[PDB]
Design a binder for this molecule. Structure first.
Ligand SMILES: [Zn+2]
Ligand SMILES: [Zn+2]
Ligand SMILES: [Zn+2]
Ligand SMILES: [Zn+2]
Lengths: 290, 298, 298, 290
């Protein structure tokens, strides 16, 4: 079973990791294509060799990109401007409008395709199949379902100012406006800076690599210049690549043996407070709301 | 496929291995979305087709329901499909299975009672492991049936070919009455159940006005779909192991053997009491004969 | 027979069959009324036997428990058998099974909580059949164990031959103390669990004092049976799937092979920390030699 | 299994119907011996052949009996005077003091037996077996048990003045002071004067034969003279016995064929409302509180 929200794209490409029950409910191909992230894992090791894996995503925005180009997951207000939904297929636009709980756009999409000659046969069935798959995925990721296995186990705050007091900041209250699928995506992509398992607090990164804003999940550092992240057949595009001119074969041969530390920029932000009584090690992917 | 709205009824928590007791007609895609057994048990009706012949031999058949309420029944016992306000009083949902209660609360779009049903089973230990799967399967099946029936879904394949008004005093002017506006308060599934159960007195096809019955055998009121005639006494309609209920039947004592043999060779006219009410105007551009069950709205 | 108070554990929902994780030693009629594994899980201890030899070889063996709490644990984690006031906070009864909640609410005589436990399950459909019997069986077994332990039973074998005090300030005068008055507040099962798990500092068979240990390893306080020493730092005591909990494991990095091989055939003094507290006066007309369990009230 | 309250009688006599699961929880032999009643079945016959059987008792007090001799099930206040518990076995006294919730008498019974030499050896095990059996039976018949299966489908009132409504009289109020076992005994013995299944009131008897007043359930007619009911070793009992001086042989010869209407005096009193939703045909023997 392809557990990808974008696996239902069909005229009116999923990586093999979509079939895995990772909990993202989106394939790495579609994550790269749409949300400018590639799924990774964060192996949290003991001082012994026992480990458990957490899912993180490395954003793929550049150093020079500014403005809406830095938004990873836009808010419901500005997701129209960020994504340019007109270019993508109408099924993709329906999926995106369902993801952001925009009912007016969904109704307009349904109304526009009602006037076509083929709507009655072999089209309405397809649109309803896409709608049903997207709605099932949303309900799986939505904690407000009829009988939802919501978890108060882990308290994931996206502001660390008052997080230790179990409170939240402005970014946390802006995070609640997101839908179930978007909240799950931000939880599975934006790793916590601190992981307060019971009393023990584990600081994974010194500073946050992303900030939740009114524009959405912004891949912008809180201060200073942005980090260096080096990354439609008929479309013409300009990349302005920062080419490195020089002979590096000798240097690469010299330093071959040593382990390579990745230059990726992962998403670390917020505070995670895992309660003493937890069921963290389950792979059923229950909604796990705050 | 078992397209029975009550086929999802299973024991929510107990592992009693309960099975849905509905006939093979559940598998048939007649547009009823309910069995004759389930209709008999709950809505006090039995599904029936109505052969509407031409003046030639060729025929097209319409669905109808034979209401089962007796002559002596009165008060809340006369209602077949209760309204959303008093469906709890009529049905006595407490005595039924929790799956049945959830299905009925979904049928009447009672979100508070559905949430209460979910909450009451949150405390049991089986909810985390097994009960949640069963409850969510029941919810998914019931919601799929409702959405297939509901004309206000995301992309609803609705048809305005026929204009079924349940008040005939002004339906000739293409305007319904108070009963029709009361009929709109019902959910989609109840609307389809009433349309498949209650047949019109007049089946107006283009200019033709085919009056099926003299007067109505059922009336839609704020109380619900009442199986009571508009005037006079009610029509004579002949009719849980641990329960002790009293029927007070009306039994003859005659021989009824030689008389039965005397006229047995002649075709018997059925004595059932089907539901007849409404004015189903049919447009000249109709698509009535198609059997894909397109949900219908007025 | 499996005379373990948690041997009656079972899933109330018949869909899941939960076997009791009960040690083989539970079937013994020692007088613990709790298995080794269950006392390891809750009331953190390991059931031990304390052989009190005579001056010659012949001996009588007593029962004592070793608290499994660590050196670093402080506050609530120190409590092994909590008081009836804060047993809900200490045990986190929400995460435990409903049978465990029932047993623990009966152990502390919290009638309101037990009534709540059956009130929550009274709503589900499965309560009437295959679950009422299960809950009643669990209640009957727990009540039988408690009544066997309860000295206030109808005709109980209450024995005053051995007096067990938990305050040693004035225990020689057969007088109790603050801890003993708190000990009387516990139910019968908790009193027997503490008596079988805690041994006196000063055994006083007849007029012969027998000081078991110099200083107490446990204290009975308002919080409950605390595994905290009277003064100074706590004693060094080395020590649920799908649950992620930190451990703070202390590890030894030495080779230890040569040192271990050096002392080959020398009897190993245990590092376990048993519960020693109180002053168990024994009367000249005692019947301690018996093997039939008795409540043993003051 | 011998589901009889007095089956556990043993020094410190049950009919075969005790083994039957009837809900009486007392055999006919012990009913006659103690409560001056005998078990009977009242077959409630439908107009067509479909019958359900209802339990009933026939009191065995005579025409001339008066005072405490007319009391079938005495109240908790005066059951000592009626039963003369001193003559009975100590096990019988313990059973009766448990049945009437007299904890002080039970404790005194335990205290009297404590001083005996053999109390600890074997006698206490016997007394605890008796106590356990009696208490299990009481809890089975007690609607106020821990979380037993109490049913309110049947509303049985012993005062028909206002029993047509949900209210009750003083006789029903005095009936609540009874213990669980005595309540079940009266429910299974005192058949209703009226049975109302789904607003269909069936009058089994014109006028009552017993009254639940103070001093317990009394086998006395509400008005007029008493009805005519004809009914330990080495004990001299002088009882007045009626006698018919006639031959009474040819008269019995002539009237042989016809069915006999028994001269039994059954117990009919009160109004039993039965709800439309009920499980009256079950055999699980729920306590059936009002
Ligand atoms: Zn995909
Ligand atoms: Zn069915
Ligand atoms: Zn055990
Ligand atoms: Zn008997």
């Amino acid at each position: 079973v392809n557990r990808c929200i974008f696996a239902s794209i069909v005229s009116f490409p999923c990586s093999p990791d979509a079939y895995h029950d990772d909990g993202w409910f989106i394939c790495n191909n579609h994550l790269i294509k749409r949300f400018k992230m590639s799924k990774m894992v964060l192996p949290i090791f003991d001082e012994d060799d026992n480990q458990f894996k957490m899912t993180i995503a490395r954003h793929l925005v550049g150093n020079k990109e500014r403005g809406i180009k830095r938004i990873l997951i836009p808010s419901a207000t500005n997701y129209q401007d960020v994504f340019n939904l007109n270019s993508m297929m109408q099924a993709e636009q329906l999926i995106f409008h369902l993801i952001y709980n925009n009912e007016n756009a969904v109704n307009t999409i349904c109304d526009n395709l009602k006037y076509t000659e083929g709507f009655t046969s072999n089209t309405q069935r397809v649109i309803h199949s896409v709608y049903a798959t997207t709605k099932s995925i949303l309900d799986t990721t939505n904690p407000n379902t009829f009988c939802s296995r919501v978890s108060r186990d882990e308290l994931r705050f996206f502001d660390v100012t008052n997080a230790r007091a179990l409170r939240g900041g402005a970014g946390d209250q802006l995070f609640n406006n997101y839908s179930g699928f978007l909240q799950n995506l931000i939880r599975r992509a934006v790793a916590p800076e601190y992981l307060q398992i019971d009393t023990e607090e584990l600081r994974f990164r010194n500073c946050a690599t992303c900030i939740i804003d009114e524009t959405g999940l912004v891949a912008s550092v809180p201060d200073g210049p942005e980090l260096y992240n080096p990354i439609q057949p008929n479309r013409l595009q300009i990349r302005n690549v920062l080419k490195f001119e020089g002979d590096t074969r000798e240097l690469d041969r010299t330093l071959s043996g040593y382990e390579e530390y990745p230059t990726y920029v992962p998403l670390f932000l917020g505070y995670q407070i895992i309660n003493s009584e937890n069921n963290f090690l389950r792979n059923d992917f229950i909604p796990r709301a705050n």
